[PDB]
C-alpha cells in the first residue's frame, strides 16, 4: 500500500494506490483506500484493510454525533485525538496506519497515525509498503508554498513511485483535494496507467461444453 | 533519541534532537520531542512515541484540572503525576521523560523519570540513546548558575556530539527556554551544529 499527504498554501491533498493483496495474490485490482471521516476530513489507510475501514467508520460516526451535539463543523484534531486514544487502548492489536487530512474552522491539517497510537505532523507524509519509494520522490521535489495543481502532481508522482517500484502497490491513483472555503473533491481513479492490454484470444466456450447432472428452478419469492 | 534539560541563572532550558526512527529508517526527521504540559512546565520524551504521547496527554489533562481548582501547579507536582503514571504502569510502558518547569519561588527545576518510574531532581539531566556518548562531556562542562547564552551553547555542543555518534539521533536541535520573561522556542540546523 502507498498513501501520501501533501500540504499546499490554501489546503491539503491526499493520494493512494488501488491494489489490495492477500500474500502475493492481488485480490482487488481497483480498491478505494481513501475514506470520508466527515465531509471535509478524509483518511488514507494502510496495514490490516479490515482494521483501517472499521476504525475510520467508528470515529466518522462519533464525529458526526459530536458535530450535531456541538452544532459545529468537525475538527481534524478531534478525529486525530479519538483515533489515537482508541488505537492506544488496543496496544497495536488494531493494525491501522492512517494519514488523516482535512480543513476545518481552524485551517488545513495533515497528520499520520500508527497502530500503537503515535501521531506525527508534517507538510508531506507517506505510509505503507511503498512509503520509501513515495518519500524518495517527496524529498526530491517538495518545496514550501506549493499550488493546488503542483501538490496534486507531487502527490500522484509519489504514489506512481510506489506503483512501479513497490510490489505491494499497483493499479491506479485515487486523489482527494481539501481546499479551504471549498467542498472537498474526491478524484476516484485520477490516473489509470495500468490498463490490461487486449487478450490474444476469446475463451467464450461453445454452449454445452460443460457436462450437467441436474437442473432445477430455485424459489426466491414467498 | 537525545534529550536534556539544564537549570541556569534565569530559569531552565530544554533541548532535543528531531529524529524518530523505526529500525534504521527515519520515519520523521523534524519531530517535536519537547511538549507542553502547562504554561511554564514542559517535558522531554524518549522511548516509545505512542507511550510518551499518551502519558504527556494525560498529564496535561490532570494539570489543567488542577489549575481549575487549586491554581498553578509546582514543577514537583507535574513530575509526581508523570511518576504516578510511569511507576504504576511500569510493566506496559517504555518511556524515559525529563520534566522541566519555571516557578517564581523555586526558579528552574529539572526532574528525570527513567524506565523504572523513579523520580530524580537534578541540576541538569540527559536521556535517550544519544545521552550515553555525552556523559563524559556534560559532566566536565556543566556549571551551576550559567547565563542563557552559556546554557544554549552547553546544550548545542552536547546534543551536537550525541547526534554525531548516535545513528538514532539527528535532524535539527530544538530548544525551549523557560524564564520569568516567558516561553522562547529555538531551532538550530545541521549546517550550524555539525561543524562545532
Amino acid at each position: 500500500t502507498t498513501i501520501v499527504g501533501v500540504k499546499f498554501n490554501n489546503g491539503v491533498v491526499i493520494a493512494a494506490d488501488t491494489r489490495s493483496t492477500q500474500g502475493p495474490i492481488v485480490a482487488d485490482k481497483n480498491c478505494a483506500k481513501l475514506h470520508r471521516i466527515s465531509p471535509k476530513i478524509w483518511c488514507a489507510g494502510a496495514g490490516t484493510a479490515a482494521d483501517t475501514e472499521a476504525v475510520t467508520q467508528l470515529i466518522g460516526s462519533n464525529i458526526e454525533l459530536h458535530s450535531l451535539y456541538t452544532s459545529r463543523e468537525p475538527r481534524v484534531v478531534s478525529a486525530l485525538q479519538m483515533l489515537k486514544q482508541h488505537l492506544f487502548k488496543y496496544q497495536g492489536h488494531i493494525g491501522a496506519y492512517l494519514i488523516v487530512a482535512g480543513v476545518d474552522p481552524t485551517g488545513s491539517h495533515l497528520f499520520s497515525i500508527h497502530a500503537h497510537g503515535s501521531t506525527d505532523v508534517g507538510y508531506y507524509l507517506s505510509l505503507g509498503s511503498g512509503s520509501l519509494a513515495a518519500m524518495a520522490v517527496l524529498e526530491s521535489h517538495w518545496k514550501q508554498d506549493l499550488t493546488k495543481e503542483e501538490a496534486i502532481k507531487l502527490a500522484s508522482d509519489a504514489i506512481q513511485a510506489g506503483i512501479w517500484n513497490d510490489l505491494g502497490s499497483g493499479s491506479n491513483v485515487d486523489v482527494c483535494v481539501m481546499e479551504i472555503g471549498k467542498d472537498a473533491e474526491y478524484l476516484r481513479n485520477y490516473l489509470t496507467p495500468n490498463v490490461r492490454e487486449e487478450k490474444q484470444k476469446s475463451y467464450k466456450f461453445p454452449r454445452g461444453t460443460t457436462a450437467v447432472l441436474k437442473e432445477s428452478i430455485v424459489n426466491i419469492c414467498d | 533519541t537525545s534529550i536534556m534539560a539544564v537549570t541556569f541563572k534565569d530559569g531552565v532550558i530544554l533541548g532535543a534532537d528531531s529524529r524518530t526512527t523505526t529500525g534504521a529508517y527515519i520515519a520523521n526527521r523534524v519531530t517535536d520531542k519537547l511538549t507542553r504540559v502547562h504554561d511554564k512546565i514542559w517535558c522531554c520524551r524518549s522511548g516509545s512515541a505512542a507511550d510518551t504521547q499518551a502519558i504527556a496527554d494525560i498529564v496535561q489533562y490532570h494539570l489543567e484540572l488542577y489549575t481549575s481548582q487549586y491554581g498553578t501547579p509546582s514543577t514537583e507536582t507535574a513530575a509526581s503525576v508523570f511518576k504516578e503514571l510511569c511507576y504504576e504502569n511500569k510493566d506496559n510502558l517504555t518511556a524515559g521523560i525529563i520534566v522541566a518547569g519555571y516557578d517564581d519561588k523555586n526558579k528552574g527545576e529539572v526532574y528525570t523519570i527513567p524506565l523504572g518510574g523513579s523520580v530524580h531532581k537534578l541540576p541538569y539531566a540527559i536521556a535517550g540513546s544519544g545521552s550515553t556518548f555525552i556523559y563524559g562531556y556534560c559532566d566536565k562542562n556543566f556549571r551551576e548558575n550559567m547565563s542563557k547564552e552559556e546554557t544554549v551553547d552547553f546544550i548545542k555542543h552536547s546534543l551536537s556530539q550525541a547526534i554525531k555518534w548516535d545513528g538514532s539521533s539527528g535532524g535539527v536541535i530544538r530548544m525551549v527556554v523557560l524564564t520569568a520573561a516567558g516561553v522562547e522556542r529555538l531551532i538550530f540546523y545541521p549546517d550550524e551544529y555539525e561543524q562545532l
Partner: peptide, 4 residues
C-alpha cells in the same frame, strides 16, 4: 512502531 516508532522510537525516539
Amino acid at each position: 512502531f516508532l522510537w525516539x
